[PDB]
Amino acid sequence: KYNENGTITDAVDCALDPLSETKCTLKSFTVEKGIYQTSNFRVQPTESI
Amino acid sequence: VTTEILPVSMTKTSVDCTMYICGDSTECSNLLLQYGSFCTQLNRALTGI
Numbered sequence: 360k361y362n363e364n365g366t367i368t369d370a371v372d373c374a375l376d377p378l379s380e381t382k383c384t385l386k387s388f389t390v391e392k393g394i395y396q397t398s399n400f401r402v403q404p405t406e407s408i
Numbered sequence: 409v410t411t412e413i414l415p416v417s418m419t420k421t422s423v424d425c426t427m428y429i430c431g432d433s434t435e436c437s438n439l440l441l442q443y444g445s446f447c448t449q450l451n452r453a454l455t456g457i
């Protein structure tokens with residue numbers, strides 16, 4: 360977040376937790392009440408066959 | 409007595425544009441990103457419906 364003087368005054372770490380994911384998804388530092396789709400769960404492979 | 413049949417809703421389908429185009433592919437995803445928001449807009453349009 361760049362303020363009026365072009366200084367970064369705040370930031371969101373998009374990989375910190377699910378709320379930060381929602382903030383980054385919506386391109387906002389404020390999230391309104393509701394349900395938002397932010398990602399996609401995938402089971403990863405553990406073996407090479 | 410007569411019967412009047414009207415549709416109300418569609419199947420609530422949802423398509424993940426990244427998984428559809430570049431399913432589990434890092435190299436494809438990196439190329440898909442060159443199209444900017446095209447993928448995001450498609451996901452948004454279906455969510456809205």
Ligand SMILES: *[C@@H]1O[C@H](CO)[C@@H](O)[C@H](O)[C@H]1NC(C)=O
Pocket residue numbers: 362363364
């Ligand atoms: C920009 O800098 C001026 C001082 O030169 C300060 O008074 C003003 O509040 C600053 N603007 C912001 C958004 O911090």
